[PDB]
Design a protein around this ligand. Structure first.
Ligand SMILES: [Au+]
Ligand SMILES: [Au+]
Ligand SMILES: [Au+]
Ligand SMILES: [Au+]
Ligand SMILES: [Au+]
Ligand SMILES: [Au+]
Ligand SMILES: [Au+]
Ligand SMILES: [Au+]
Ligand SMILES: [Au+]
Ligand SMILES: [Au+]
Ligand SMILES: [Au+]
Ligand SMILES: [Au+]
Ligand SMILES: [Au+]
Ligand SMILES: [Au+]
Ligand SMILES: [Au+]
Ligand SMILES: [Au+]
Ligand SMILES: [Au+]
Ligand SMILES: [Au+]
Ligand SMILES: [Au+]
Ligand SMILES: [Au+]
Ligand SMILES: [Au+]
Ligand SMILES: [Au+]
Ligand SMILES: [Au+]
Ligand SMILES: [Au+]
Ligand SMILES: [Au+]
Ligand SMILES: [Au+]
Ligand SMILES: [Au+]
Lengths: 333, 333, 333
């Protein structure tokens, strides 16, 4: 609710970065300039290069939408920036630096908006959001072929093997302290406790409810994995949190009106997001590749598509969907 | 066509088991209380534990739909029970017993109805039924991650390997006798001739035509596999029947009006269901996992979606679709 | 624009081969009798057996549509022939001859039209074409199971392995000369320079623009692969051209109105088609199977679905879509 006159002051370059500011927030569904800025802050706190590659992905994807002529409202809301952000981080997270790295980030960001547009047209038939699938599909397509096209070289995180039952480690208070905040950091490939805290503060600025569901998701994803007898190391590193962080955020009052029934619904989703993390990890291990946020995407899509069938689960028209605070105030209109 | 007064006698607990009775029948698309009861009978004849785990899956999935508030008509028809039934059997069929087994069956049953609702909303745009895909997707998601989450331990049926050409065995009269009825038993993971016979009698009670297509499907799936030079062992064990049993049933006058053209159409589908069994078996072998009824699902979806394009193949509006006897009597309205 | 009286001369057997003539052209989206004839010519120039197996697939698929009762206009345009053509070549390209080869080609052709009908009904909701996906899905289903059903034996091109980084070879003028025309030949599994030239002449007969985009696609797919540091051998053999040939053709003024913006759009697609070739090749290597034209299909579907979102990219209503020359003349109506 800013003064309408402030628009006399808009030049297209400050309009562009506002798109970038919010694009980044929309990685965790927060349509908020400051949230995104603070996301950047947190990534930059962990690494300068991932910081620039996050910005370039966001910039590359947002620009591509404008060049292609996406409706200005979609572009202004950050929906064509979120997946670019992740496309820019994932690539130097998984591959060793080569000069061509930046060009490839540009390509991957550019590709995300093609796919964002694809999914919005496809899923639009059911009012289901595209979530972060543009980044997963683009990045898989650009990463899988690395054994056949040697421009980049895979980092040691990528190692083809048949799955098998492998030791177990030891749960300590640290397992919990570190798993929690890295769970949140790992939403954007940030192996860093402080970054994760920064990310919660960043969400908190836009919404207390979403910040709380981000914390809960991470805890739910974490203890689901221990209940399921994961080795301690993946769990301390937030590997079983971050899909559930995203579940927590999206289910926890953004796409459904927060109440006691929608809350239990969101709990179901956070748990299955952790279990699905094991599932796609295994499915992709013969080619050594990361499932990324596909466990969040599949589970969440499942719960979103089911919504219109369940009368005790109150769905938000996606056209409308704002923060959980705003959705409840709106329902009282 | 029961007296309407009989509803003065309905208490919610007898309403619940009627849902469970029919849920189970709907594993082979038979909206029939007695059929389901006899399915239970047959499973129980083979094993008491698979019997209870079948009931708990059915109970867990049906309850979840009611808790979530699915339209009472959908719940009363067993559509939210069929996939729960299978989710409850598959888990102790493939994994060794651990105390947590029952909770996990509850979880898996619960998950099926989420997915049932998902698919009904998605596929509803084309009037295409969800078949048994809720169970396949839920169970894959809950099974694949077992190498990474060690709560359960995979049975010896699960063994990651690269595919290769492997001896051939010897076809005998027994190959046929046993392959036929285990083909039907294996629709519900019942390695048992008597169970299979029980299952045919169970279908027969509701529909002679469906019982006949279940027999034919099994034979078609069986000899397709020999024509294709399968080793004798998978074929005697009904492994190449049961996807074709399901094809036979669904195509054979439930979703299409039985005539000479629809019959040949159903033959096409039963054959490709056998070939697809080899296909998904291979696709999933690097991670050692069962395709389950995915070969039936893909092929059948293909033929169902094609239906509205082929004018010589008379489709049933899925809203209406009852037994093959009732569909023909209805067409004569 | 032939005299309408010429239809007094039509007997159903000459109507049938006209369907076969155009079916074959429609493998590269050319609704043109002579183009298809010349495609046949070119295949036959390379091999007599692939020639007959191309015709039988085309014949088997086209007949199945007529037997099933597809709208005569769809059948007359070759849309139910293109995928049959490829189903007939792929099978003896990848498997050693066995007597049953021809029956299987008939089966595979027959299956393509089921899937053509499936996809047309499914994708019809967005006006998106089915491209060559009927052939990929049918052929995968009929090929993957070969390790479990030994009727055919895989040729040495099929060899299950975990991916890994493998020497590099040496780019010469020949890499380019041979890569270019085999890029075009390989659209139909024709490892033959002359065949490829024949194919360009064949397209040229129907459309200069499409013939040019076929050449460009092949070059773009080729140098993308070198930029990406592919070994020289796959590139000289046209393995990185043919998905991009198809991209080039479909994007280059058939499905979008050719202009400076649509051209850059098509460039994006051709590049990602090459990168996706590496991607699906890797994804399917644990089971040793060819991605075929899936890299073209996924990328192209992505750009097609995105179309209606991008206002600077002018889409063709698919109902209407003819050659790029005719689309521009139509836009001037
Ligand atoms: Au800025
Ligand atoms: Au800004
Ligand atoms: Au900014
Ligand atoms: Au900012
Ligand atoms: Au949003
Ligand atoms: Au950078
Ligand atoms: Au970088
Ligand atoms: Au715990
Ligand atoms: Au806990
Ligand atoms: Au009962
Ligand atoms: Au009962
Ligand atoms: Au009952
Ligand atoms: Au009963
Ligand atoms: Au039914
Ligand atoms: Au049990
Ligand atoms: Au059990
Ligand atoms: Au036979
Ligand atoms: Au037979
Ligand atoms: Au002819
Ligand atoms: Au002709
Ligand atoms: Au012809
Ligand atoms: Au011809
Ligand atoms: Au066309
Ligand atoms: Au032949
Ligand atoms: Au042949
Ligand atoms: Au080059
Ligand atoms: Au070049």
């Amino acid at each position: 609710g800013r003064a309408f006159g402030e628009q006399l002051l808009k030049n297209p370059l400050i309009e562009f970065c506002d798109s970038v500011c919010r694009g980044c927030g929309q990685v965790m569904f927060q349509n908020n300039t400051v949230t995104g800025l603070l996301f950047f802050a947190g990534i930059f706190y962990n690494s300068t290069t991932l910081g620039v590659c996050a910005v370039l992905g966001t910039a590359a994807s947002t620009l591509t939408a404008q060049l292609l002529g996406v409706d200005k409202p979609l572009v202004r809301a950050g929906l064509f920036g979120a997946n670019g952000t992740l496309a820019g981080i994932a690539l130097p997270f998984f591959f060793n630096y080569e000069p061509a790295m930046l060009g490839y980030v540009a390509l991957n960001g550019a590709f995300t908006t093609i796919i964002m547009a694809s999914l919005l047209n496809f899923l639009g038939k059911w009012g289901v959001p595209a979530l972060t699938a543009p980044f997963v599909l683009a990045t898989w397509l650009l990463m899988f072929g690395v054994y056949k096209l040697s421009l980049f070289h895979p980092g040691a995180l990528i190692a083809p093997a048949l799955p098998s039952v492998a030791d177990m480690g030891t749960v300590t208070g640290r397992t919990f302290m570190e798993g929690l905040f890295k769970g949140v950091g790992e939403v954007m490939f940030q192996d860093n406790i402080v970054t994760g805290v920064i990310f919660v503060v960043a969400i908190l600025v836009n919404s207390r409810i979403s910040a709380l569901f981000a914390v809960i998701g991470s805890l739910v994803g974490l203890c689901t994995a221990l209940i399921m007898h994961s080795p301690e190391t993946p769990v301390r590193l937030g590997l079983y949190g971050f899909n559930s962080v995203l579940c927590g955020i999206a289910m926890g009052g953004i796409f459904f009106y927060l109440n006691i029934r929608t809350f239990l619904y969101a709990l179901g989703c956070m748990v299955l997001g952790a279990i699905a993390t094991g599932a796609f990890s295994v499915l992709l291990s013969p080619i050594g590749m990361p499932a990324l946020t596909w466990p969040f995407i599949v589970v969440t899509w499942l719960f979103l598509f089911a919504g219109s069938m369940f009368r005790n689960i109150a769905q938000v028209p996606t056209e409308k969907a704002g923060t959980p605070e705003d959705n409840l105030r709106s329902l009282a209109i």
